[PDB]
Design a protein around this ligand. Sequence first.
Ligand SMILES: [Fe+3]
Ligand SMILES: [Fe+3]
Ligand SMILES: [Fe+3]
Ligand SMILES: [Fe+3]
Ligand SMILES: [Fe+3]
Ligand SMILES: [Fe+3]
Ligand SMILES: [Fe+3]
Ligand SMILES: [Fe+3]
Ligand SMILES: [Mg+2]
Lengths: 164, 164, 164, 164
Amino acid sequence: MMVISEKVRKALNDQLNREIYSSYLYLSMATYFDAEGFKGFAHWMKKQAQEELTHAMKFYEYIYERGGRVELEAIEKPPSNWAGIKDAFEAALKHEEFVTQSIYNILELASEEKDHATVSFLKWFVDEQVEEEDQVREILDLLEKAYGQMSVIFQLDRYLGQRE
Amino acid sequence: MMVISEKVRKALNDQLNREIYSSYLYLSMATYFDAEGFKGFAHWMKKQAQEELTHAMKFYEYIYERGGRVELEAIEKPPSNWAGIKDAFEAALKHEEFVTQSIYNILELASEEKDHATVSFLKWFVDEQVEEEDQVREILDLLEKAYGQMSVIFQLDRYLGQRE
Amino acid sequence: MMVISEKVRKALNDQLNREIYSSYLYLSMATYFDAEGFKGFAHWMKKQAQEELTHAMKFYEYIYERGGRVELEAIEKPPSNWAGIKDAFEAALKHEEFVTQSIYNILELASEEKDHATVSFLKWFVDEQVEEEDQVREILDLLEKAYGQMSVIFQLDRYLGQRE
Amino acid sequence: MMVISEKVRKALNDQLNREIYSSYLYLSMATYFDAEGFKGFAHWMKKQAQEELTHAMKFYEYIYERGGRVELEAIEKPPSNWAGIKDAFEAALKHEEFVTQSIYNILELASEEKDHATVSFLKWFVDEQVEEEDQVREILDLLEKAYGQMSVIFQLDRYLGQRE
Ligand SMILES: [Fe+3]
Ligand SMILES: [Fe+3]
Ligand SMILES: [Fe+3]
Ligand SMILES: [Fe+3]
Ligand SMILES: [Fe+3]
Ligand SMILES: [Fe+3]
Ligand SMILES: [Fe+3]
Ligand SMILES: [Fe+3]
Ligand SMILES: [Mg+2]
């Protein structure tokens, strides 16, 4: 029997679908980088793509642990194109910043319902969102010091290309 | 873009400098124990002065992860002298309980601001302060039993001198 | 029983507090570099901050080995910002030149007191200073030849970030 | 052909005979401790007797490396008894302070003769003396805190008997 409220379980099932769209958007950003020929920026986006699926599946399993069930919704067609590589990472950071407020809302909800289990579970994601945002800001700060200079963008592309 | 409010960024930069003073105070307690010939008690204070610096850096790294920047403030001269070994450790405990409260104030503040990243971050330090206080209470407890019997005080000195 | 003069003890104690300020100042230059996005330069300053505490602790242990004791004085608030990478290191070297002069003065003093134990002890620091200055001009030299591109000031940052 | 002065050679030769007396004196303090039943203190003095012969042999080899030769003079009968453990070590340190002054005098002499080879050679002994004195005050310090019980003066004897 479901020991999570339907309201809270909807909030988790939504953020779940939100993390899948997160992976999808990133995969799409890989299509952008691959098209412009930065195979290393593309490699990074694909790796973030599958990291988001591991986020999705943490919500998947917690929902069933508390006796819920997941309904996968439709996935919106994500953007296909950005200005510079700086613009895509700005869209990345904005999306990440939107994802962390999505999670704060689920947190604040469960806090009102005194569902301490969901309140606790959700803290891994509060910490990982600090890392995910910071990952992106560091990249943007280096982009803006490349200042177009492409010997440096090569050094970035080759580098991000080495993420495991 | 700083994603922490300046009010909480100031509280953490304060708590950083406060962790540095802890390090400084403890090394001063080591100057005392060394002047009094207890080189193993002094080893403990030099080891714990080191621990405090790692605490300071945990705030350092966190402030920059949230778009902040650290400004180091002046460090008040700590005391040079205590009554005896019991008095010095009692000063240490009363100082760690003050640190614990000081951390509580930043958590109660971040909570009011719905800044859940900082509330989660400070979990590590509340758990850590539990052990810091207990480390010191444990030691005080065996000095009372010692009641001067420098066969026990000696063997304690010789054993707290193998802290890693 | 103390076998250094009180003039020489004080000079060693002042030097210990100067080495500790140095540690603080270097950590302060890391708070600059981290704010400006050069995690490698920040890594180098942080590693330099640790080194200066091992210099402080070498004046520590020597004072006690001569029957003396260490008083820890207050740490002045250090500068928190500089005009550029070059400018921060120019401040770094101007400081290092000031410590080597400071050490010189307390060498010439122990000489006059025909305290040969302390003259011999300070040889190590006369040697370490020669390196610590030269290490910093090598960096100013590669920075006067870097004159602008992030392509060199990156490969430099990245490599200075490998200081063990 | 001899390249030290005869004033400096004699001073080194007198010092060699003083290091040898030291070896004898320390062996004599072991004959006290062994009579009084403290085989560990006796072990420490015996190991110290060997060490002083390695100091004697360092003035030996240096004299021949400068074209000189060593005359062995007569060894004065040393004291054979003391008022207590504390008192014997107080005599030990009073002696060590006398050798470090003796060495100082022949350093200040080689300086005046601008014999820099011998000034540099004596650095090692200025360093070793700082340790040999400090090692003995550490023992007087643990003996002023031992003030009576064989329970501490045993665990001390036993451990000093582990000197390699
Ligand atoms: Fe995610
Ligand atoms: Fe993410
Ligand atoms: Fe702490
Ligand atoms: Fe602490
Ligand atoms: Fe230094
Ligand atoms: Fe330095
Ligand atoms: Fe000797
Ligand atoms: Fe000796
Ligand atoms: Mg601890």
